[PDB]
Chaperonin GroEL (Escherichia coli), 1685 residues
Amino acid sequence: AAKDVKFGNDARVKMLRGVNVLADAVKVTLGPKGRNVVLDKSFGAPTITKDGVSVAREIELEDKFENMGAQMVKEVASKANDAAGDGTTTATVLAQAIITEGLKAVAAGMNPMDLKRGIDKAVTAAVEELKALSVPCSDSKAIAQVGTISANSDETVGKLIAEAMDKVGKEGVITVEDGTGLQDELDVVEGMQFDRGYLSPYFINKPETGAVELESPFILLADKKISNIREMLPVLEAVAKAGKPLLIIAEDVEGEALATLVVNTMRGIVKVAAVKAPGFGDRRKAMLQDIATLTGGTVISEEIGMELEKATLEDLGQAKRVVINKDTTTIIDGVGEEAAIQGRVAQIRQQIEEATSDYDREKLQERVAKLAGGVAVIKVGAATEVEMKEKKARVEDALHATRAAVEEGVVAGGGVALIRVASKLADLRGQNEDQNVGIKVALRAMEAPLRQIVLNCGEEPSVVANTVKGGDGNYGYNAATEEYGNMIDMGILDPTKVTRSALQYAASVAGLMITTECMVTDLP
Amino acid sequence: AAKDVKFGNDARVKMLRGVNVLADAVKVTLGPKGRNVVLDKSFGAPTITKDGVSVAREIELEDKFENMGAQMVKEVASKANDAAGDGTTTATVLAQAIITEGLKAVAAGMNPMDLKRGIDKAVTAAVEELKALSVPCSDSKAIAQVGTISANSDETVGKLIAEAMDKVGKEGVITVEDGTGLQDELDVVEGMQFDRGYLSPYFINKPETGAVELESPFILLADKKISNIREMLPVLEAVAKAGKPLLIIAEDVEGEALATLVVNTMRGIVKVAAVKAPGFGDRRKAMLQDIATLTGGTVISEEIGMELEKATLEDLGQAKRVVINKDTTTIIDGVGEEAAIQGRVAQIRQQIEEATSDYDREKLQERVAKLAGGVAVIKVGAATEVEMKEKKARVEDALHATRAAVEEGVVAGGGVALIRVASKLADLRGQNEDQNVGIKVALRAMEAPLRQIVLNCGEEPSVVANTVKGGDGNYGYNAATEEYGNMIDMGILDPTKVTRSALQYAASVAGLMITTECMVTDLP
Amino acid sequence: AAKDVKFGNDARVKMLRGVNVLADAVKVTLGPKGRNVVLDKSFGAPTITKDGVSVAREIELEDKFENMGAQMVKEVASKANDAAGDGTTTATVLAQAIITEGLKAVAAGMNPMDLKRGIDKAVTAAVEELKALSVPCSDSKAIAQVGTISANSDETVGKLIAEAMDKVGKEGVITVEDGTGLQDELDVVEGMQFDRGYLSPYFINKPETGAVELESPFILLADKKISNIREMLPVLEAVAKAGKPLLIIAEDVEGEALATLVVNTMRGIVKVAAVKAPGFGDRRKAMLQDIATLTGGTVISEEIGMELEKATLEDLGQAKRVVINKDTTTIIDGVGEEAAIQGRVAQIRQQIEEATSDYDREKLQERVAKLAGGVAVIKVGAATEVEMKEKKARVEDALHATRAAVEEGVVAGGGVALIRVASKLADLRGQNEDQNVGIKVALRAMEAPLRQIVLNCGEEPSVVANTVKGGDGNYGYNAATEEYGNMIDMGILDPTKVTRSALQYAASVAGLMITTECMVTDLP
Amino acid sequence: AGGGVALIRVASKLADLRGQNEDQNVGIKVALRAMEAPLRQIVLNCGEEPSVVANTVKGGDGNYGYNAATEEYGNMIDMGILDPTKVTRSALQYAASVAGLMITTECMVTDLP
């Protein structure tokens, strides 16, 4: 197909215009005073919302180059959620703030490379300053404060989350499910989570949640390549007869099997999920055996001598629930026997004692920790289903926030930490004038999010920005009360991880984009 | 009338367009490798010329705003010519460089005030360094070298220039006249020069020369306003009867008399020109008295009861020749008697001895210097009239150059000194990013002349400029021979004053441009 | 007035277009096979012609830049006529070829000034080659051969020219006048010719002749500037009363006097011709005195105290006829008495005896020769005025040709000399590829005119071109006979001067044009 | 050596190559001048003025050249900025082949839009 080509100035300015469109469309939601956006729904009624994530997913421009520019920033910003639940809006705002001045500098004419390297130096210094400014949060009381703050001051949810974390350490896996009644329950159950996403978004039965949820699904553990549906005919027939869902845990699925499963999911003929086995090689095999033990199924591999055309519900693994995402997957309430689990635990512990290699010993330590940590599930109870669901959503939000908090302490929110570190790093310099103007650009961008928040409030931005910069420490301007003081004292704060991730990703996109000479795309 | 108004970018871009068009039309003539430019002339065939001054004078753009920019640049750059001979090409090339870079920086969003301040500071530093690098010219040998260089290897012309300089002192006014015979002559005749010029271009009997010349005209000495032509009635009647030209020196001329003289010259009724009386007040009165003594004329005043309507041919002074310019006016070969001249000289000497006040002492000192020995003139003899003509032209140019030399020394030519000082002034810095960028802009800009010259040669301008910058002292690249070496040896020396004035004027125009925000121009 | 400005290739393309149209309109006429061209005449019926000079004179293009190029080429070619009448078409063809090749090379990127230098060096080599190849033209036999060749093989006019040349030596000025009978007459008459043309184009009573002719006009010798018609009142009125024509010779005529004389000529009030005095200063005064002695008039100047306001017909000198050319003026049949002529001749002879320097002796020798050589008149005789007129025109052309031939030898025609030197100059080279390509351009283009003539013959051009190149000496292709052989034997030949000047002028135009980068024209 | 340093050096080494006519000579000059193109382009990508570094490298001999990474000079071999001979030779030869085939193009046949 004939491809249009643009070089230098025109291409970069087109991308900049697209980026400005996206930023103007998204940032308006930022801040407690966040405005509203309306999303056209051709089939039915429109929906109001403030979720920058939703607005971003909806944005798609007409001109190809503008669409290109918008989409790249969308893609990078999405990873803010993958990192720490929230932050996409901050990432996009920083992207616009950097890129505007950066491309202005380019147009004026300076070594774009030197500008990029200066940006990177400034961002690294910013990361160091964030680490210095961070405040740890591991105590139960601080954890509860963070959680309730995230959930809009719900001490009950905060306490529940803190109790779950105490019960299963701060590394265990936590999940949420609907409470049977008004009360709430904190359980301990077998299961395990591993860094594996879904093989195709089509598997998503819960698109609004951006996840895959399955109830009492069968489990398949085939440690080998998968390309042909013919291999899965008997298990598929048995699953259809039973009516329960299926899960596919294999080395990989492609070709005919992949296409057939995709078609079935698209037409909803059968609900089944697939994901690549965690890890690789020998440790992957060991983890698969562990999963079989925990699930009550059986590992099947041609090297062992059994075929997928002979597998039956008896040796197929079974569990009462599982959850899968674009990134991670977890097992809920397996079927494996606790005695067998303990035997496997002792076996792997003995293997650890045998393991002289430090790396392999750490791998086995992680495996045994995952196996023995079980799983903790919190049951959300409310008078009405609506209340239950809202509390569940807030619980997930606070759980993500607390995860990030235990990960990287916490810092004052409202972009206050960003502007504070910006003021601190005012005397950073590079190896050339272009690099130094890059430093200036980086700082001018880091000043943006607070200005946007204030603009949303109504008061003139630069006034409050300068006042806060003149302040120090945790000092800042609370939008909620439209006053000044300490965010930590006022109870507003952000998980340092989100700020770090947003700044780093914004710097990455700016660096990639400022170094674009030729674009190419398909003609209409 | 309704006016078209532009603000900011919409206006500065247009001024940049006009300036760039003018620069592209002019600079091509720079350097010993100057190209050819065809200038239209709606009488017959077009004229090929290499005179950047003529090219600029002819340049004028259709668009109102582009014409505005081009005309203002022309006007200001012309001051370099008026001060130190040629001036124009270097002034325009510089102005273009600084204006382009400054507008690019301003579009880059930098404080224009600080940009202008930095440019001016760099100009100051460059002026000081150039003065330091100046090669003094205080000897007959150096004067002759400069003269022959200016006249393209004319040792005899240089020798004549040196002889005249010695005869009439360095500051002594000098001019040239067509030689009567083959041999050249250096005579001394009574005359005087004062910093005044004609009032209307219509008085220019020799528009090609840009100067007014009259042979044995009459001289008017009325130190009062010329209210009405009634005063000029008997004067013009007697002048027409005598069939002679007439020179008018008056304190002031009103609109009626000015327009009457304008129409008289347009119709050529009488060869009459007007010039402001030198100086003002008492010193003006004294100078007019001295002029009367020199010319044999009579002072006309109401205090003495002597009015113009009663004036006769006797009252007006005479002098065999006269020359006038934009601001330079000289009386040549006055008719007054040496006895009266000596008497006035003695009177002024006694006044000097009586002068307790310094200011008045120096006033009388320049008066006596002006009156001492009158003027020395060059008789440009040649075998044929053509030879006489071009010898006279080149001799006048060399005279201007030698004046500039004896004034402000001399430096390496071809604009090399500009880069020689720019490289040395790299360490200069301002009080913020804006001033720093302005300084760097000026530092880059000064390269323009040499780079344009080498480009005309066709060699790699960047390579040659880098080599010269690596060089030192008067070492440089002779575009004429396409060789390197010390510019002093090959004798390509540019007068210091012309370069200084060109740089100053370019800086002034650049500052006024950058500081401009709004234009008002008539609707096209 | 705003001007349209063009640059670079987009500028020189229009110059090339203009030159191409001019060449395609002129060159076709060149050669014995000259194709007819018909010129517009608003008066009515058009005119068929092959006069390339006329065709060029009548060319004017709509586009301003094409007009510029065509006018420049026309004016430069005009110098071919100025030199020897012929050669204008040859110059135009050479200009077309050189310009096309040079602009093509410039498009190739070759350095323009290096190209120009190569062109000029090759041209100088060709000049010296032709100088070597020249065959002397002198003595009765060669004079008669040249004359009859010029007059289309008319031994009659050839013999007349030879007899006149013998009568009046070599440098003796000769003239052509209408006779009174069938037979012809040679004579010695009093007159003189000086290098001064008409002071206004309106003085050309014979526009077809491009020269002034007056029958027994009065002669005015005013050795002073002439600015006002008031000076010429009495003489003009006396001339009008007498009804005779008037000739004006003055040191300078300008301003109101010139304007009034032009108005009178346009209105036919009085037949007046104006010309500047010869030379300058002392030699000008001496020549004016000699002219007065020859004419019987009196020199008028303020130095003697005699004013033109008192001049009379008796005061003015008289001669039966006078002629003024584009650049030279001649007086025929002066009234000055032989006694006075001998007296002045002896005075100047004594002055020669007192003469010291070779410069003075040569000047005086030239003056005495011009005075004492007299003049000869070719009284064309024939049966009818028509044939008399054609014979007169042929005599004029043959006189020009013979003058040039005796001046600078003579060489074969048909550009065969050009191609011969082109062949001889294969070896030449230069310091760089640009110089070499310039040389090749020069040779190839200089080879063009013979190809054009052949193309007019209807034969294949390159065949004859290479045949001649293979040939040697004066061997060539006689277009009239359509046969090869020696030009000298077949009586085909042209003056050396005409071809030399044509080549030089074409080279000069090519250099000037290729050195063009910027063009400025009035807006259409 | 890499960075087009070998190509520019050889191009320098071919100063006085010649052909049987000026057309061949200009063809050779075109080839040699084109040889420099990669080094000039990479220098431009550095953002600094190309001809400077081009002539600077042409002045030296052996392996002296320009390093983009360090922005400095030295023995390109010692910094390890080097390429296999085969790749550069094949690139030059293929470029020459395609250029010759293109320059020898007179007529064109293709389908309409």
In short: Chains C and A do not touch (no CB pair under 8 Å).
